[PDB]
Design a protein around this ligand. Structure first.
Ligand SMILES: *C(=N)[C@@H]1C[C@@H]2C[C@@H]2N1C(=O)[C@@H](N)[C@@]12C[C@@H]3C[C@@H](C[C@@](O)(C3)C1)C2
Ligand SMILES: *C(=N)[C@@H]1C[C@@H]2C[C@@H]2N1C(=O)[C@@H](N)[C@@]12C[C@@H]3C[C@@H](C[C@@](O)(C3)C1)C2
Ligand SMILES: CC(=O)N[C@@H]1[C@@H](O)[C@H](O)[C@@H](CO)O[C@H]1O
Ligand SMILES: CC(=O)N[C@@H]1[C@@H](O)[C@H](O)[C@@H](CO)O[C@H]1O
Ligand SMILES: CC(=O)N[C@@H]1[C@@H](O)[C@H](O)[C@@H](CO)O[C@H]1O
Ligand SMILES: CC(=O)N[C@@H]1[C@@H](O)[C@H](O)[C@@H](CO)O[C@H]1O
Ligand SMILES: CC(=O)N[C@@H]1[C@@H](O)[C@H](O)[C@@H](CO)O[C@H]1O
Ligand SMILES: CC(=O)N[C@@H]1[C@@H](O)[C@H](O)[C@@H](CO)O[C@H]1O
Ligand SMILES: CC(=O)N[C@@H]1[C@@H](O)[C@H](O)[C@@H](CO)O[C@H]1O
Ligand SMILES: CC(=O)N[C@@H]1[C@@H](O)[C@H](O)[C@@H](CO)O[C@H]1O
Lengths: 728, 728
C-alpha cells in the first residue's frame, strides 16, 4: 500500500533534510536565519532576539542573494546580482546597510561586478576585488584606497585565484587574509601570462546568432603553470594621496629553484604569519614563519624556523599540506602529519625546535583539528569501532595525552556515527552535526563539562513523511583482498530477501583519498533505484581510497587507473558470489574520476559488467589540470612518468568495449573536465567500429546541474539502466 | 536468390557500379584511364593507343592524387600532398612533366600549398593561386609572373572563392576564367574583412593537448557579406620588370547601390565577356556584356546590351541565374528562363535587342543546355512521358524551332529514362550516360546522323552479381492532392506482397528545387533497408520541389518550414491509406534540409510518425548562411521577414517531441550546418523535459564521411530504426 521513493521524489526534492546553519559571532552567541529573519541566539540559555526582520529590504529593489554582517554588528553587506563563474568564483553587486542608523549608505558604493568582498575579523573595515585589483575601505561610507594597480583580466590576479588555484589549491576564489587584528591585509598575486588557454564554444540563448568562444587560462598536465607572489599591507597607515606600500614575502630558496605553489596561509598572531609552499613535484613542502619588524616595517622569516615536510611513498598531505593550528601565543602549533606507520595523526611542533611530537597514534586517522584551548585540543577521527567511514568528536587533555575522551561516540549510537562540528570563539560551546546513518541531528553543547544543552533540529517532520514510504536500507561492511580489509556499502531494496537475486549497480568514484562507503544518510538517485526499481547500489573503497593510512592511499602513486580499477572489478566479482546478486545484471557508473574508472573497467574485458554509464569522464591524464594530475602522476615527460600517462587512457581500450553497452555523457561548457576528454573517447570508439550511446548537454558545465538538465540526465540514465536490466 | 543486400554490402561496396569517365581533348579524341594507364581514343573509329603508361611515375616518390594534361598534349600536371578544405577547396603540391622530353620539370616549380591551378584552354599556360594571390606561367619551366599582391588569409581572396561563394554561388574554389584564346585571364576578388567568424573546436589526434579553434568568415542570415571585384589581365603583355596591369570591370550602377553578388562569368568571344550580377535580394539580376577596346586596353560594358531578369513570385533561377550559351560569333546567346506560365525553357537572345524568343514551350522544363552548333542546340529535359523525374537529350533545329528530335528516349526505354551527356569539342560526338531505372549504361554517338557508334560500359559484371541477390524494386508514381500531381518513389522489398503490411521509412530532403522521386538507380542505405529488413523507403516531392514549374517551386517563397513540411506529413497519410503500410510503424529521417524537415515534422504533433532521425539539421534559419537562406527568406528584419524566421524554428516545437522517439546526430566540425544548430535543438528539448537520443561525431564535417564515421553512423541509425520497428 505504501508508496516507493520515486525518481520524481528525487528530482523534485519531495522529502527535504532540514539543516541548522549557524554562524558564531562571539564566545556565547550565534546568528541563525529563520523564515528570512536573522536571529541572534544565546547559547547557554537558548533565548533569542530578532536581529534583522525579514521585512527589512522588502522594497530594496533587487532580490538579495546573500548577506554578511560586519563582526561588530554595525553593518550588513547585501549581495545581489550574483553571477556564477567557476566552482567558487563569482561576480556581484553590493550595498551596505548601516544598522545603527537605518540607511543604505549612498556614496562610495562598492562597485558593480565586484569579484570578492570581506569584512575584517573585527570592526567594519572592508576589502574587495574589482577588475583583479584590491581595494580597502576603512569606513563603509568613505572612499576606498586602491592597493594594487597591476590587475588585468585573465593575466594578473590580485587577491583572487586563477582557475587552477581556485579549483585545486585553495578551494576558494578568495586570496585575501586579514590579520586577526584587522591591522594587516595579506594577499597573493597570481600571474598567468604564459598559461595556455582552453577554448570552447558557448551557445547561449537561441537568439545569439554566432556562438561565443570562452577562453580560460588552464594548465594541462606538464604545461606552463601560473606563478605566484605574496604581499602584506598595513591597513592602518593608508594615505589619501600616497599609493599604499605592499611588502613582499619571498618563498624559501628551496622553492625558488623551480616551479612551486603557495598552498597555505595562516596568521599565528597579530604579527606572525605562517606560509606553506609546495614544489611542483608535490612530495616536498616548506612552512615559513615570518614576523613583523615594527622598526623596519618589514617582514622576516628565520630559516631556523622553517619546517620541512617530505613524502617517500606519495605526495604531501591528503590533497595538500595540512593547516597548522597555533597556540594562543603563536610559539607552537598542532597539525596532522602522516606518522611512521603511515597513519595521519596530530603532531605538536614548537617553532624554534626541529622535530614534532605525536599526540595521537593508532590504526585510524585524525580527520581534522577543530578547536584548541590551553587545556584541550578537539578533533574528528574515525577511531570509533575501527570504522573508517565513521566520524566522531574527541578531545585530548594537553597536559596528559593518554587522556582522550570521545565526546560524540555515545550520544545516540544507533542513529549517529558521522559527526562534524562547529565551535564558538574560544571553544566555549559547540554545535554537533550528525549526518547518519539515521536522520541528521543538530545539537548544541557546553564545553565546560560537555553537557548537552538542547536539540536544535531533529528532522522530525521528515521522519513523519518517510514512515509512509518503503525506504531502502544500507549495509556497511568489508571484504578481504590479499589479507587486507576494504570497505563497501550496499543500498538494499526494501523487504530485501537474500534468497532472491537482484541486479547490481556499482556506483564508483575511487579517486585518490576518496571514500564511498560511510555512515551518512543520503536521499539520492540510488535511493530511487533501490526503493522503486529494486536494484542494489554498491560502492567500494579499494586501493587509493583515503582515511585508512598511506599503505592503502598511496598504492596508486604514479599509477592512476590501475589498482583502483582492478579493485572495483574484484569487488564486483566478490559481490557476484554472494547469493542475492544476479551475476547477469551487473552495471557500473560514475562521474568525473568515477567516469574514468567506469570507462577503464568497461574497457578491461573482465566480462564482469553488462553495461556502464560514464558522465564527464577524464579519458587521458594529459588533458586534465597540472596541479591535480601531477600530484599523483608526476610529469608527462620521458624522464619522469610519460609511459604510464600513455598507458592509462580510455582510448587504448576501445576494442574491448564491444562486449558492453556504454552510455557516454558530457557538458559542452565543462571548464573542469573538458568535453575534449569525451570527444576523444567517442572518436576512438568510432575508429574501431564500436557502437555505443552518447548524450551531450548544451552549455552545461561539469555539474550538469541546471534544474532542467539535472532532471534530464537522471531521467536518461534511469531509462538506460532499466533497459540494460530488463526492468519493465 | 536466398541472399539479400546487407548493411555490410553498402558499407563495404561489395557491388560496385562501373563508370566510364573520359575527358575530350579535341573534336574527335578523348582520354580514358584503364588500370593506371592513360589511353587516348579516336571517337569515329574506336581505335586507341596508350598515351601514358602506368609505370612512368613509379620512381616519382609521392602518391599522385590526380593529373591534368595541357591542351596541346605537351605537358602534364601531377597533383600530390592533397589536403581537403571545404566541399570543393583544397591545397596541394604540383609537379610538371615534359611529355616530349619525357622528364620532370625542376626549375621554377609550382609552390607547395597551392590552392588552385588551371591550364589555359589552349596551349600550355598555367595560372595558379598561392597564399591567396594569383600567379601566371607562360612556360612550365620559366619564372611565374605575380598578378596580385593583395592576398591575405581569410580576408582577401584573389582568384579563389571565400566560404559562402564556394558553397552557394560558384560551387567551386576557382575564381579564374581564361578567355578562349588564353590571352586574357579574368578573376574575381573577394573581401571578407567585415564578415563575422564562426568558431568551433577541432580536437585532432589524441596527442594534441589543447583543442584547436577553427575560425571561418561565414555570413549567417542578415550579417555583413563579403564584397567582390572583377578584373581582367592581358596575359600576352606581361613583363619581368613591370607589374601586371589588371583592368577592373565594375558592377552595373543598379547593383552598386547596395549589397550584390557576382554570380556568373562567361567568355563569349576572344574579346567579349559576359558577367551576371545579383542583388542581395535575389529577385533581381543584371547581365553585362563587356568588350575589349583594343586601342585603349580597356573593357567597356555598354548598356545597350545589358539584360535584366526579375522574378515577382520568387528568386531568379533555380539556385542562381542560368548560364548563357553564346553562338560562335558572340552576337547572340541561349539561356534558360521561366516563361509566362512558370515553366523553364530555352530563350534566344540577340545581344543588342529587347526581350528574347522562346524556342521551347510546354508543361515541363529544360534541365540544361548541353551544346550549341551552327545547326542545332542540344538540351536535357524531362519532357518524355510527362515524368518530371526523367531526363532526356533533345536537339532543336535552329532554322526551324518546331523540329525537335529526342535523341535518347527510345534507345532502350525500359532500362534508360535518365540521361546526362558529354559533348566533344564542337559537338561532333557525344557520350550518353544513362543512370536508371536499370543499371547504368555508357554509349558513344556521332552528331552527324546521331548514329550509335559503340557501347562503352554496360555494367554487365554488376548485372550478373545482382541476379544472385534479392534486390528491391522501385515504384515511381504520383498522388493527386488538389488538382495537382505530386510525385513519389518507393523502394519496395523483394517479393513485395500488397496483402502484407510493411513498415515505412519516409526519406526526406524537400529543400527548394529538390527532387527525391526520380528514375535513377542507386545502391545505398535504403537498398539495405528494403532488401534485408523488409522496410519500405518512400520519398515525396511536394511543394517547393523542382523541375515542375514555378507554381510549385515558388509556393514556399519566404515561408520555409511550412508547405514542404505539411506535404511530407500529408504524403505519409496517403501512404497510410494504401493497404500495404502498417501505419503504427512509420518513420522519417533526413540529412541537412531533410534533417530540418524531419524535426519540424516530428514536432508537429501530427501523430503520424512513431520515430525519426535528423542528421546535421538546420534548426533556425538565422543560423544558416546568408546567400542560401536569404534567397528564399529575405532578411530577418522586422521590416522584411523576421516574423517567419522566428516562427519556423525547430526549438519552438520542443513540447510535441514527447510524442515520438527522436535521434539527433551532428558532426562537431561541421563548417556548413554548424553544430550550433543541433546544440540549440537539444537544449530546447532538455528545458522542456523531453527524452531523446543523440550522437555527436567528433571532428566530422557535414558529410560525416570518413569511412569509420560513415560506417558507424549508418550502423547506429540501423539499430535505432530496427528497434523502433521491433525488427529482430
Ligand atoms: C572529477 N571531478 C575531476 C577529474 C579527477 C578528479 C579530478 N577531478 C576534479 O574535479 C578535482 N578537481 C577534485 C574536485 C573535488 C575536490 C578535490 C578532490 C576531488 O576528489 C573532489 C577531485 C579536487
Ligand atoms: C544542407 N543541405 C544545407 C542546409 C540547407 C539546405 C542548405 N544546405 C546546403 O548545404 C546548401 N549549401 C546546398 C548544397 C547542395 C547544392 C545547393 C542546393 C542544396 O539543396 C544541395 C543545398 C546548396
Ligand atoms: C540574544 C539574547 O536575546 N540574549 C539575551 C540577553 O540580551 C539578555 O541580557 C538576557 C537577560 O534577559 O537574556 C538573554
Ligand atoms: C558603484 C556602482 O557601480 N553602482 C551601480 C549603480 O550605479 C547602477 O545604477 C546599478 C545598476 O548597474 O548597479 C550599481
Ligand atoms: C605583473 C607581472 O608580474 N607580470 C609579469 C610580467 O612582467 C612578465 O613579463 C611575465 C613573464 O613571465 O610574467 C608576468
Ligand atoms: C588514338 C589512335 O590510336 N588513333 C589512330 C591514329 O593515330 C592512326 O593514325 C590511325 C592509323 O590508321 O589509327 C587511329
Ligand atoms: C616545389 C617545392 O617547393 N618542393 C618542396 C620541397 O623542396 C620540400 O623538400 C618538400 C617538403 O617541405 O615540399 C615540397
Ligand atoms: C584589398 C581591399 O579591398 N581591402 C579592403 C580595405 O581597403 C577596406 O578598408 C576594408 C573595409 O571593408 O575592406 C577590405
Ligand atoms: C615591379 C615592381 O615595381 N614591384 C612592385 C613591388 O615593389 C610592390 O611592393 C608591389 C605592391 O605592393 O607591386 C609590385
Ligand atoms: C483551401 C486550402 O488551401 N486547402 C488545402 C490546403 O490545406 C493544402 O495545403 C493544399 C495543398 O496540399 O490543398 C488545399
Amino acid at each position: 500500500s505504501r508508496k516507493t521513493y520515486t525518481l520524481t521524489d528525487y528530482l523534485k526534492n519531495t522529502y527535504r533534510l532540514k539543516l541548522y546553519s549557524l554562524r558564531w559571532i562571539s564566545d556565547h552567541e550565534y546568528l541563525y536565519k529563520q523564515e528570512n529573519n536573522i536571529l541572534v541566539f544565546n547559547a547557554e540559555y537558548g533565548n533569542s532576539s530578532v536581529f534583522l526582520e525579514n521585512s527589512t529590504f522588502d522594497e530594496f529593489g533587487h532580490s538579495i542573494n546573500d548577506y554578511s554582517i560586519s563582526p561588530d554588528g554595525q553593518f550588513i553587506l547585501l549581495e545581489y546580482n550574483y553571477v556564477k563563474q567557476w566552482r567558487h568564483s563569482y561576480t556581484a553587486s553590493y550595498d551596505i546597510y548601516d544598522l545603527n542608523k537605518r540607511q543604505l549608505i549612498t556614496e562610495e558604493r562598492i562597485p558593480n561586478n565586484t569579484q570578492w568582498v570581506t569584512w575584517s575579523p573585527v570592526g567594519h573595515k572592508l576589502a574587495y576585488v574589482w577588475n583583479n585589483d584590491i581595494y580597502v575601505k576603512i569606513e563603509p561610507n568613505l572612499p576606498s584606497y586602491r592597493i594594487t594597480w597591476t590587475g588585468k583580466e585573465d593575466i594578473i590576479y590580485n587577491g583572487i585565484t586563477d582557475w587552477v588555484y581556485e579549483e585545486e589549491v585553495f578551494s576558494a576564489y578568495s586570496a585575501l587574509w586579514w590579520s586577526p587584528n584587522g591591522t594587516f591585509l595579506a594577499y597573493a598575486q597570481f600571474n598567468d601570462t604564459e598559461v595556455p588557454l582552453i577554448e570552447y564554444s558557448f551557445y547561449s540563448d537561441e537568439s545569439l546568432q554566432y556562438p561565443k568562444t570562452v577562453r580560460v587560462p588552464y594548465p594541462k598536465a606538464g604545461a606552463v603553470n601560473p606563478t605566484v607572489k605574496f604581499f602584506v599591507v598595513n591597513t592602518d597607515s593608508l594615505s589619501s594621496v600616497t599609493n599604499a606600500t605592499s611588502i613582499q614575502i619571498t618563498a624559501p630558496a628551496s622553492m625558488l629553484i623551480g616551479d612551486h605553489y603557495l598552498c597555505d596561509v595562516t596568521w599565528a598572531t597579530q604579527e606572525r604569519i605562517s606560509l606553506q609552499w609546495l614544489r611542483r613535484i608535490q612530495n616536498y613542502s616548506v612552512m615559513d614563519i615570518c614576523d613583523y619588524d615594527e622598526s623596519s616595517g618589514r617582514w622576516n622569516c628565520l630559516v631556523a624556523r622553517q619546517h620541512i615536510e617530505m613524502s617517500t611513498t606519495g605526495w604531501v598531505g591528503r590533497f595538500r599540506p595540512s593547516e597548522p593550528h597555533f597556540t594562543l601565543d603563536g610559539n607552537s602549533f598542532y597539525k596532522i602529519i602522516s606518522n611512521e606507520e603511515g597513519y595521519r595523526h596530530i603532531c605538536y611542533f614548537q617553532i624554534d625546535k626541529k622535530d614534532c611530537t605525536f599526540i595521537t597514534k593508532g590504526t585510524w586517522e585524525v580527520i581534522g583539528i577543530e578547536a584548541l584551548t590551553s587545556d584541550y585540543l578537539y578533533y574528528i577521527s574515525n577511531e570509533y569501532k575501527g570504522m573508517p567511514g565513521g566520524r566522531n568528536l574527541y578531545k585530548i587533555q594537553l597536559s596528559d595525552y593518554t587522556k582522550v575522551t570521545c565526546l560524540s561516540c555515545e550520544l545516540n549510537p544507533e542513529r549517529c556515527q558521522y559527526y562534524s562540528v562547529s565551535f564558538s570563539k574560544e571553544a566555549k560551546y559547540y554545535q554537533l552535526r550528525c549526518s547518519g546513518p539515521g536522520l541528521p541531528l543538530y545539537t548544541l553543547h557546553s564545553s565546560v563539562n560537555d553537557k548537552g544543552l538542547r536539540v536544535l533540529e531533529d528532522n522530525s517532520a521528515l521522519d513523519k513523511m518517510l514512515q509512509n514510504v518503503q525506504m531502502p536500507s544500507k549495509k556497511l561492511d568489508f571484504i578481504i583482498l590479499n589479507e587486507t580489509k576494504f570497505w563497501y556499502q550496499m543500498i538494499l531494496p526494501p523487504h530485501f530477501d537474500k534468497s532472491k537475486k537482484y541486479p547490481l549497480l556499482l556506483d564508483v568514484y575511487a579517486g585518490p583519498c576518496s571514500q564511498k562507503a560511510d555512515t551518512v544518510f543520503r536521499l539520492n538517485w540510488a535511493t530511487y533505484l533501490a526503493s522503486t526499481e529494486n536494484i542494489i547500489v554498491a560502492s567500494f573503497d579499494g586501493r587509493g581510497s583515503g582515511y585508512q593510512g598511506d599503505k592503502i592511499m598511496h598504492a596508486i602513486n604514479r599509477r592512476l587507473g590501475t589498482f583502483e580499477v582492478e579493485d572495483q572489478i574484484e569487488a564486483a566479482r566478490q559481490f557476484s558470489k554472494m547469493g542475492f546478486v544476479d551475476n547477469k545484471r551487473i552495471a557500473i557508473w560514475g562521474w568525473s574520476y568515477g567516469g574514468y574508472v567506469t570507462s577503464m573497467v568497461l574497457g578491461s574485458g573482465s566480462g564482469v559488467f553488462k553495461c556502464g554509464i560514464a558522465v564527464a569522464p577524464v579519458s587521458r591524464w594529459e588533458y586534465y589540470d597540472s596541479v591535480y594530475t601531477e600530484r599523483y602522476m608526476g610529469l608527462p615527460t620521458p624522464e619522469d612518468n610519460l609511459d604510464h600517462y600513455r598507458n592509462s587512457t580510455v582510448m587504448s581500450r576501445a576494442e574491448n568495449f564491444k562486449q558492453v553497452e556504454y552510455l557516454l555523457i558530457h557538458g559542452t561548457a565543462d571548464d573542469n573536465v573538458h568535453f575534449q576528454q569525451s570527444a576523444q573517447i567517442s572518436k576512438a570508439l568510432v575508429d574501431v567500429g564500436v557502437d555505443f550511446q552518447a548524450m551531450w548537454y548544451t552549455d552545461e558545465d561539469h555539474g550538469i546541474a541546471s534544474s532542467t538538465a539535472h532532471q534530464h540526465i537522471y531521467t536518461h540514465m534511469s531509462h538506460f539502466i532499466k533497459q540494460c536490466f530488463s526492468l519493465p
